[PDB]
Design a protein around this ligand. Sequence first.
Ligand SMILES: Cc1cc2nc3c(=O)[nH]c(=O)nc-3n(C[C@H](O)[C@H](O)[C@H](O)COP(=O)(O)OP(=O)(O)OC[C@H]3O[C@@H](n4cnc5c(N)ncnc54)[C@H](O)[C@@H]3O)c2cc1C
Ligand SMILES: [Ca+2]
Length: 267
Amino acid sequence: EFMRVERVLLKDYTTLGVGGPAELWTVETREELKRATEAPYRVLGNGSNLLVLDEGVPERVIRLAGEFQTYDLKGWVGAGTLLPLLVQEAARAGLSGLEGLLGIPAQVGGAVKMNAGTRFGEMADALEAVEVFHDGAFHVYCPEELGFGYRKSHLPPGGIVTRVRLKLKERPKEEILRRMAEVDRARKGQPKRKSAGCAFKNPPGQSAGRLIDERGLKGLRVGDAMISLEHGNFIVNLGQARAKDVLELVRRVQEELPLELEWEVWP
Ligand SMILES: Cc1cc2nc3c(=O)[nH]c(=O)nc-3n(C[C@H](O)[C@H](O)[C@H](O)COP(=O)(O)OP(=O)(O)OC[C@H]3O[C@@H](n4cnc5c(N)ncnc54)[C@H](O)[C@@H]3O)c2cc1C
Ligand SMILES: [Ca+2]
């Protein structure tokens, strides 16, 4: 009954660095989660796939912390745990199964919601069980029950991923690290770092980054929003970008290429 609730700007809680006002509820316990979800809500993970508009959102924005950030690689892993932590912890433990998720700056819950992945593997591959809170109760699902597709899930309506069990296998630490090194090599062309990740989806048999590059769109700038000079499928925030500027740049790309956004827009 004593969870932290505060007014924030979502620009401070997204990797893109844009976003207006929201009421943030930081939940540490199952009872606090039950209370936070009594009115309309959204769940915020690491904010790495969100384009939040300058007006912000009116709903309660829930962050999972406390018990939801504790983990055991061989047991339950809280959904508020950072996926980059688990990738490194698995290597340390000689546990294979997360290597293909290197470089994805997600919380576990966000990685499940967006079935985050690379050419090497996806979040769904690494799951044994998923606890989802919906309709006022906690339920346990196998991943085959969650409607996974390419960078997609079909969670129960209003579902909050709270905890998972991972599917991992014993391998030599050095081998795990070699696999991770290939993932790192494959990601070398992405910006030395800053964004909400890939802005656009790839059309069937096409590449968004390559298409944007060939169209000469790298370097186009609206205010402080710019198509990265390093990778065509990244829009970067050069300092004080507004979401309006990012959307304008998106529209400019879409005037040239029939691309759909990979980012989710709030509200
Ligand atoms: C530098 C960079 C590189 C990236 N590379 C990749 C990549 O290689 N592959 C890839 O797939 N994606 C990539 N992304 C996109 C992004 O990291 C993924 O979509 C990631 O899964 C989002 O997780 P998040 O915790 O940041 O979620 P957020 O952006 O916070 O939220 C995304 C969605 O998940 C929901 N959500 C968050 N937590 C929960 C929860 N506990 N329960 C239910 N719903 C929840 C939110 O409501 C929202 O709908 C990249 C992003 C960046 C910035
Ligand atoms: Ca079940």
